[PDB]
Design a binder for these strands. Structure first.
Ligand SMILES: [Ca+2]
Length: 976
DNA sequence: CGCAGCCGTCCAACCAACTCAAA
DNA sequence: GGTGAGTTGGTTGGACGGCTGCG
């Protein structure tokens, strides 16, 4: 081939690592540990009693393939050549081609020029509607950056643009390493343009050199090593972003059409021996050969692989957590389920097994009954053969989407550690590209218990359902079984990691039980994936933000806003510089008068719009605004000690304000269609409106993150300053206008029915970041739910400006304020809401958890306890030491007395009082020694001097000093 | 009877182990 | 990616108060 394929298509030799337990009639002395040594035969697969080599492609293969090429052999049917008109892009790659490298391919001159002598090529990855895999390579996208003309001319004595091209070329030749060679001024194109720096209102338009560069590597050097005295603009912008922004309409995910170019040129199909990727067909084109295909929105037949690995620790402890760098800690099985992402149908069930494995009739009957495919079990003699066969599947079937549970944190890191460290397989050919592609995992950072990681593989969207579900569903435990019982309501089986070595050693039937359990977990995760449809959300954000779905997952929130801002800033002639290097506090207490929550709809975005906040409307200096009129043409605001100014929208409209304005218009338009739309559309529209929400809410954070892409702490500080002043204005208005019931009634004549017995008062009692809680003494809760909408409306007219809206969320009938962001309350509908508090403690026993709930539930649902709890707030805490406790709390005390009785009673259901831990270590002293579970294992409290199981959970219950348990532990301390 | 020394008790801070959470 | 797991429970050290001994 023209570019070498770097994945394995042939293999004669490998490091054979396999458990000695797989050898039949081995004596017990040999039936332990692993073989580890080289073997000189082809890697091999056994399936249903047939054998094939792993890397043999042809008829009879034990797993499906969607690969045209294998090791440069074209396995397409004779004369295969599908016409491509429309195709759906899901991911975009950017790579440097060199005309010299491609000289043996049959490419037209108009492509060769765009890579002469080098150039970035954008590769669109997709399917046709018939399910043919396509790559379209787009030529001609130069990256570019700007520098101020007067600073450049003065700094390095340039007269005309080709001088700057020579200066940059020289700065490449003279690099500290030999990293840039073959350079000329022609690697650059430079032109003079007029632009304005995005920062500050006073800033004049100036002449900049816009410099075009052929490679992101060349750019990254000039934007760090060349004239660092001169500030640079948009040097961090990648070729993908330039491609998406420079062509109106274009998207990183969606349907496209091939079409004639400006000189009636066409896309050129590549020959098979010139393919860059594992695709059925490939094309060269330029961006004028492309258009969006409007009216297509159905996803094509992409394939999803859901996978899960089982591992067995092979060292001195068979029950320790396995470590990939220890050769003897093996991958023993991999379940791999292949779905069609468009129909949601499970198409294949593959189980890779080290050692023979016979799946149970029970399991095979259950799958057949559920209508699912019959599993193919693939058996391997060694761990290398298995990992190579899984990676061979990944390259040959090429699943566009991959999922699993903790696949980023464990399964991929363990596999790729094994493949790179133990075995020495180059991963750069195992993605969509045939070599030199990204295939990498990395650790997030200093996070020691929560080991967390990211992955990028070219052309493969990794979505981990652990990430999706932790980001969505509030749960006590995120173990996959706990999630299956919570989300799918489905009580599936367990096999412990402690059971696995005992099962694995027994024989093929017991290794089958490991298979059943492994398959079943991948099925649960597939069902979770197609419940949440997370690809549709990530797709929606990718389309909206103008970034690929890969960056949508693995990069932060900032790049989303940055890319949108960059498009808009360009339209308006701005350029973005490359970044260098209290009365609201709750008096805690219990309220039995209704509490209305007012809450600002999207406070920070609505402030940004209302007050026209932006980089480009800010000023720090009065002579910037001395020609304008105060209050009319600009806002003045003291923020963090500085006097900031922001010109109002009719002087200059904020770029942030325009982004937010336009997004919220789209969100309305979509949500207006949802009730009319067909149920297939209704889910898509729901994903679109959700994508817009997360992008809007990220604007505030984007400005506030220092050393971010485009920071402006003055805007973030003004947003939060205005937010604080708005909450106090809300409090002052509410207190001043509605001091007396008559004033409320004059504004809302409904209040005549609402009026409850006793004194009327209406006071703010808590104020969050963007909500206010109003204690409505002397009003009934029922009508107050409705009057709150009209109050919130009236406040939003009297105060504030048209993008800002205060809304009535909810009415508590009873509320316990505990602290900032901690409260419990019962809503008017009877539902209890708990915020910032856990009433069940994970380390406590059932007796304590249930009794804790009983006390809180009684405070909220017994009005006698509620009223008496309100009476407590009449006095300081110390005075209730002297005075008798208020009448009505006796029923609350009664639950404590009852629970106390139930400790020291016969017929104590001891099972409610069982604490628990798993011993895990060896059972002797360590440091702290007296760990309860050790003294109910080793120095056993109640019973004989040893306990059978070292790695499972010790149940234990505390008991009285008795001159019997004392003697037991005090003598066991001597036995020791 | 007063003062000094020693012992006991209480409080605060730090360190270690468990938990998921993958096996 | 910047903060460390939270959490608790046990152990050690320091301070304060009370009782006993000595002058
Ligand atoms: Ca997993």
């Amino acid at each position: 081939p023209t570019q070498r394929h770097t994945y394995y298509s042939e293999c004669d030799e490998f490091r054979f690592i396999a458990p000695r337990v797989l050898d039949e009639d081995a004596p017990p002395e040999k039936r332990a540990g692993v073989h580890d040594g080289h073997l000189k035969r082809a890697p091999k697969v056994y399936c249903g009693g047939d054998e094939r080599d792993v890397l043999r492609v042809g008829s009879g293969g034990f797993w499906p393939r969607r690969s045209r090429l294998w090791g440069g052999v074209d396995h397409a049917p004779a004369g295969f050549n599908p016409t491509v008109t429309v195709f759906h892009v899901y991911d975009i790659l950017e790579n440097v081609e060199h005309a010299y490298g491609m000289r043996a391919a049959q490419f037209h001159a108009r492509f060769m020029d765009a890579i002469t002598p080098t150039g970035t090529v954008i590769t669109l990855l997709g399917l046709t509607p018939e399910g043919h895999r396509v790559a379209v390579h787009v030529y001609g996208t130069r990256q570019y950056f700007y520098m101020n003309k007067e600073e450049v001319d003065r700094h390095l004595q340039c007269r005309a643009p080709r001088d700057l091209c020579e200066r940059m070329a020289a700065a490449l030749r003279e690099s500290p390493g030999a990293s840039f060679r073959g350079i000329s001024a022609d690697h650059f194109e430079a032109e003079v343009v007029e632009r304005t720096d995005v920062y500050y209102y006073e800033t004049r338009p100036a002449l900049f050199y816009r410099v075009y560069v052929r490679s992101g590597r060349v750019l990254s050097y000039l934007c760090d090593n060349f004239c660092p005295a001169i500030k640079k603009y948009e040097g961090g912008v990648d070729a993908t972003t330039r491609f998406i922004l420079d062509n109106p309409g274009f998207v990183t995910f969606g349907w496209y059409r091939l079409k004639p170019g400006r000189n009636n040129t066409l896309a050129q199909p590549r020959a098979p021996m010139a393919f860059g990727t594992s695709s059925d067909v490939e094309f060269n084109c330029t961006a004028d050969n492309l258009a969006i295909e409007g009216g297509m929105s159905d996803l094509p037949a992409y394939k999803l692989m859901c996978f899960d690995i089982e591992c067995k620790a092979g060292g001195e402890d068979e029950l320790a957590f396995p470590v990939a760098g220890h050769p003897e800690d093996l991958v023993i099985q991999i379940s791999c389920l292949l779905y069609d992402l468009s129909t949601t149908a499970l198409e294949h069930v593959l189980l890779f097994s080290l050692g023979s494995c016979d799946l149970p009739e029970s399991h095979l009957n259950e799958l057949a009954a559920r209508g699912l495919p019959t599993p193919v079990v693939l058996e391997f003699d060694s761990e290398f053969e298995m990992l190579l066969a899984f990676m061979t599947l990944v390259k040959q079937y090429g699943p566009e989407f991959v999922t699993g549970y903790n696949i980023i944190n464990f399964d991929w890191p363990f596999l790729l550690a094994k493949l790179t460290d133990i075995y020495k397989v180059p991963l750069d050919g195992y993605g969509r590209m045939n070599g030199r592609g990204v295939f990498r995992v990395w650790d997030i950072g200093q996070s020691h218990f929560q080991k967390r990681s990211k992955i990028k593989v070219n052309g493969m969207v990794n979505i981990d359902m652990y990430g999706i579900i932790t980001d969505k569903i509030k749960l006590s435990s995120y173990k996959l079984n706990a999630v299956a019982e919570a989300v799918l309501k489905d009580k599936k089986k367990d096999l412990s990691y402690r059971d696995i070595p005992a099962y694995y050693a027994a024989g093929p039937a017991q290794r089958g039980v490991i298979g059943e359990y492994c398959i079943q977990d991948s099925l649960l995760v597939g069902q979770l994936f197609f419940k949440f449809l997370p690809h549709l959300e990530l797709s929606a954000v990718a389309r909206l933000a103008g970034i690929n779905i890969t960056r949508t997952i693995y990069d932060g929130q900032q790049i989303r806003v940055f890319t949108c801002l960059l498009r808009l800033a360009d339209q308006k002639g701005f350029i973005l510089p490359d970044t260098q290097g209290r009365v609201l506090d709750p008096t805690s207490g219990f309220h039995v008068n209704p509490v209305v929550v007012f809450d600002f709809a999207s406070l920070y975005p609505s402030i940004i719009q209302a007050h026209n906040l932006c980089f480009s409307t800010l000023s720090l200096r009065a002579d910037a605004v001395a020609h304008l009129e105060a209050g009319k043409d600009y806002l003045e605001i003291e923020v963090g000690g500085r006097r900031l100014f922001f010109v109002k929208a009719h002087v200059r409209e904020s770029l942030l304000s325009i982004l937010l304005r336009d997004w919220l218009a789209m969100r309305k338009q979509i949500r207006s269609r949802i009730p009319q739309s067909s149920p297939e559309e209704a889910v898509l529209l729901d994903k679109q409106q959700a994508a817009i929400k997360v992008v809007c809410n990220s604007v505030y954070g984007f400005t506030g993150v220092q050393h971010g892409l485009l920071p402006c702490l003055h805007v973030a500080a003004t947003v939060t300053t205005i937010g604080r002043e708005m909450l106090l204005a809300t409090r002052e208005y509410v207190h001043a206008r509605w001091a007396a019931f008559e004033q409320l009634l004059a504004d809302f004549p409904e209040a005549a029915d609402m009026r409850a017995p006793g004194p009327y008062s209406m006071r703010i009692i808590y104020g969050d970041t963007d909500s206010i809680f109003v204690l409505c003494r002397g009003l009934t809760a029922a009508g107050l739910t409705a009057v709150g909408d009209k109050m919130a409306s009236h406040i939003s007219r009297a105060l504030f400006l048209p993008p800002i809206k205060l809304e009535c969320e909810k009415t508590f009938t009873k509320l316990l304020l505990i602290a900032k962001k901690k409260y419990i309350g019962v809503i008017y509908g009877g539902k209890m809401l708990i915020k910032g508090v856990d009433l069940v403690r994970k380390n406590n026993c059932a007796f304590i958890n249930r009794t804790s709930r009983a006390l809180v539930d009684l405070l909220f649902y017994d009005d006698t306890v509620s009223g008496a709890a309100a009476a407590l707030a009449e006095r300081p805490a110390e005075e209730w030491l002297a005075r008798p406790l208020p009448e009505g709390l006796q029923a609350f005390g009664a639950v404590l007395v009852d629970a106390h009785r139930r400790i020291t009673d016969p017929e104590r259901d001891i099972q409610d009082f069982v604490l628990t831990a798993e011993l895990s270590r060896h059972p002797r002293a360590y440091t702290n020694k007296r760990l309860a579970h050790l003294t109910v294992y080793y120095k056993l409290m109640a019973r004989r001097a040893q306990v059978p199981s070292i790695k499972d959970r010790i149940p234990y219950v505390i008991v009285a000093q008795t001159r019997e348990v004392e003697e037991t532990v005090a003598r066991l301390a001597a036995l020791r």
